[PDB]
Amino acid sequence: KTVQVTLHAVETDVAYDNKGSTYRAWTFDGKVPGPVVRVTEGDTVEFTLINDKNSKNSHSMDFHAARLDVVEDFESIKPGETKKYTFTADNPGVFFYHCGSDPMIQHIARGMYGVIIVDPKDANALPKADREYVLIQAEHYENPDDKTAMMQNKWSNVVFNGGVFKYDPVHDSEATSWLQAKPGERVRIYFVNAGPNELSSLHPIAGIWDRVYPSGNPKNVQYALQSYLIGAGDAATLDLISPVEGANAIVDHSMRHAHSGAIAVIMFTNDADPEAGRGENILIR
Amino acid sequence: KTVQVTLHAVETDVAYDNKGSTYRAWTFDGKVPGPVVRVTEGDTVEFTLINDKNSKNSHSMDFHAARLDVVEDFESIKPGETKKYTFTADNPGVFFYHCGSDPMIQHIARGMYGVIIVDPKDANALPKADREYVLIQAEHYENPDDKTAMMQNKWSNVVFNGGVFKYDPVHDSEATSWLQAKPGERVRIYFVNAGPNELSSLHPIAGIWDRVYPSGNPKNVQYALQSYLIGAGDAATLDLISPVEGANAIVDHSMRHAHSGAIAVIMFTNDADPEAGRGENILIR
Amino acid sequence: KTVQVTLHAVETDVAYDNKGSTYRAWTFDGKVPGPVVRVTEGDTVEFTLINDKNSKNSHSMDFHAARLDVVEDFESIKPGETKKYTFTADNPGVFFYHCGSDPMIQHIARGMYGVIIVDPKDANALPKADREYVLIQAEHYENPDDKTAMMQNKWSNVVFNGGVFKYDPVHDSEATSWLQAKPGERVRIYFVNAGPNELSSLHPIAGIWDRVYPSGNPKNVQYALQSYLIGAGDAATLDLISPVEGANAIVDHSMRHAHSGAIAVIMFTNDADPEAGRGENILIR
Ligand SMILES: [Cl-]
Ligand SMILES: [Cl-]
Ligand SMILES: [Cu+2]
Ligand SMILES: [Cu+2]
Ligand SMILES: [Cu+2]
Ligand SMILES: [Cu+2]
Ligand SMILES: [Cu+2]
Ligand SMILES: [Cu+2]
Q: What residues does Cu(2+) 2 bind to (chains A, B, C) (predicted)?
């Protein structure tokens, strides 16, 4: 099918921790991460980027799901301008999207990133998931204007979905969100490492990845992995099943990353919310 | 079968180089790395942790081979307490174990880490190894109390099995240990990257990895790899066969890691000790 | 077949950026990277290294394609000396080669690295490439004598084939080289990450890796990867096909790397130079 996707480049204050601290983010649609885009393998995507008139900077859009021309298609547009391009989603899986404007390190760091999920045309290529969650890792830099700190890799926190310990009520009692499932359910994690700089060594504490798919592609399946390396600008699909009620903690096992905010709790309970990890709830905001 | 495994949390001084430099380590059973645990896929493990009465810190145990509840099973216990849990080893391969107590970066860095090997139920899934050796990479930090330096990734050395150049009598005149095999033999390396922070890019100088199994699982086999990336908190099984007498040097090929201590020599001789890499000589102490 | 490969260890000034900045490089055959070595799986390589009489340092040769003895074969030779050894290329793919002399971090950093390509004996094991390009990533250090800065990972730039933005006319007006292909053609990238220290997260902006081969080996094929991690001292083969005229930009997606020089443009045009990416043009000088 043909789908229309329109996003705004929006520069606005957003919260990055559980105590309400904010920073001047650069975003798609006013939130970090950007909106989940979801299509089927083979779909035509008619994409529109609107750079809001009140932006102070030029912005662009790079989809890792797209095969295009970097110079024309991923070009920067000024505040008040609108850009269109069309691409087919040729390969199934999970893909990073982000602003490609100058300097990319900063546009990514300030929050212009998201995921596009490309469902396999063959609905039987992946085992059926009972829950789906998006987790996007990024570094948070204390001063969004300081490009030198970014070049020097001097981050303040490493986070999932834009918030320090957003999903960790164990380590931060002010956290108000977490992942849910029932024991025995297949939980599918769509993971993107936005960077801009760091790698992630992703591990479910007290669990194991039942299966891992590099770039989300069924052909690349790996089994029973305790951990999986996701480089900067890479993405993978990782399945998790708990045999028991309780919790696992999804961590970036480079411990200084984990301690700085990269931990997400999943609670396994028999009375898990039927809406959790389904529908429009896959990226928990 | 059901296997009983009991470990003590023991805070004690241990050596970290070949000239007898010591640090105040936190350990399982008074040694770094902890005791090798070895079971068969499908086995029931009845585990007991005893936190010694003279410890000054709470400790815990996290097995990457276990599928449990992080909150109750991996909970920290006080000096003088004893904790029990049972798990089945559902997946074959090679798995990191470590203390999970706060802050994990420090409990790992201070020496609370080891390996559990889960032999495949199908003893013919893996090609028969003639020798087996455990190598666990970790960073050593000069001051075990300086958590800031750990968070800044400012390690003093990167080491195998707790010692600077432990197995490198070429670069260290004071080194007395090395790995042994005969030409033509299949040498199986059980490798864990304990971290806490760093990645390892593992290469046998003058050799090639015949096979590499991510998380040690036979289903994930890779062939003829010059190098293999093991992220912090990950493990893999790597096979090596020399066609000639002489040496290879197993290194973390991120050269600043290798030069800081992460080199292990394997000697291939026709008269290799029939006891080396067999029984409980697999982790050379 | 048996092939003779002779290289010289040459210490000489070479350019490392598009404005003609030079440094005192240590090299094979007076250029950085060294000459491309290409043989077929099963071939016998009769190798000779001659250390030039005017060299000030001892040098050696380490082929990741060789299974030998680190002690005797990879030994260092003084200025005016010659080392000879023979090896069979037992495994197909793509392999790092470099000086292995004390300290390896500096010998690599100063330019003593290259690639050996080992074509599969089975001509059909890889899909047929229409273009081939060699890309070797390395860190450039400001002062080639400052070993402490290397040990501390304080690099100035991360580069492909010895040059800051060597193939990026888009981000550097003084860049005079880039990769060329036609739309629809299979472009094969032989990628080596020489390090000495850093990881690469390789991504074609506006494209996708059709296939990736860890160590170049047909047995390890992965499909449709957006990005691929190449550790220090590792190598891989990566195929790229653009369906359209335009450009892709091959980048190390750890952005502080890319912005420091690690970006190579490939131009897809209907009248690409028939000589580009063929014969001995594959490593563009
Ligand atoms: Cl032991
Ligand atoms: Cl045991
Ligand atoms: Cu932007
Ligand atoms: Cu990208
Ligand atoms: Cu502990
Ligand atoms: Cu762990
Ligand atoms: Cu040299
Ligand atoms: Cu090497």
A: 62, 64, 98, 253
Which residue among B205, B224, B254 sits closest to C195, beta carbon to beta carbon? B254
Please give, one letter per residue, the 3-state secondary structure of chain B: CEEEEEEEEEEEEEECCCCCCEEEEEEECCECCCCCEEEECCCEEEEEEEECCCCCCCECCEECCCCCCCCCCCCCECCCCEEEEEEECCCCEEEEEECCCCCHHHHHHCCCEEEEEEECCCCCCCCCCCEEEEEEEEEECCCCCCHHHHHCCCCCEEEECCECCCCCCCCCCCCCCCEEECCCCCEEEEEEEEECCCCEEEEEECCCEEEEEECCCHHHCEEEECCEEECCCEEEEEEECCCCCEEEEEEECCHHHHHCCCEEEEEECCCCCCCCCCCCCCCCC
Mutate to test the interface with B, among A201, A241, A242, A257 (most CBs of B within 10 A): A201
A254 class by beta-carbon count within 10 Å (0-12 exposed, 13-18 middle, 19+ buried)? buried
Contact B123, B263 (CB under 8 A): no
| DSSP-derived 3-state class of residue A39 | strand
Identify the nearest ligand to the CA of C202 by its number: 4
Q: Do C233 and B203 touch (CB under 8 A)?
A: yes
Q: List the domains of chain A with CATH numbers.
A: 1-126 (2.60.40.420), 127-285 (2.60.40.420)
A259 phi and psi angles, rounded to 5 deg: -65, -25
- What was the experiment behind these coordinates? X-ray
- Pick from A102, A139, C17, A205: which is nearest to B66 by CA? A205
CA geometry: angle A41, A43, A44, nearest 5 deg: 145
- Position B132: which residue type? E
Among A205, A224, A255, whose Cβ lies nearest the Cβ of B105?
A: A255
Contacting chains of B (3 CB pairs or more, <8 Å) are: A, C
- Pair C114, C98: CB distance under 8 Å: yes
Q: Dihedral sign, CA of C255, C257, C261, C264?
A: negative
How far CA C189 is from CA of A116, C115, C131, C204, C258, in Å, comes to: 26, 12, 8, 11, 18
Alpha-carbon gap, residue C222 to C235, rounded angstroms: 14
What is d(CA C234, CA B225) in angstroms, rounded to the nearest whole number? 9
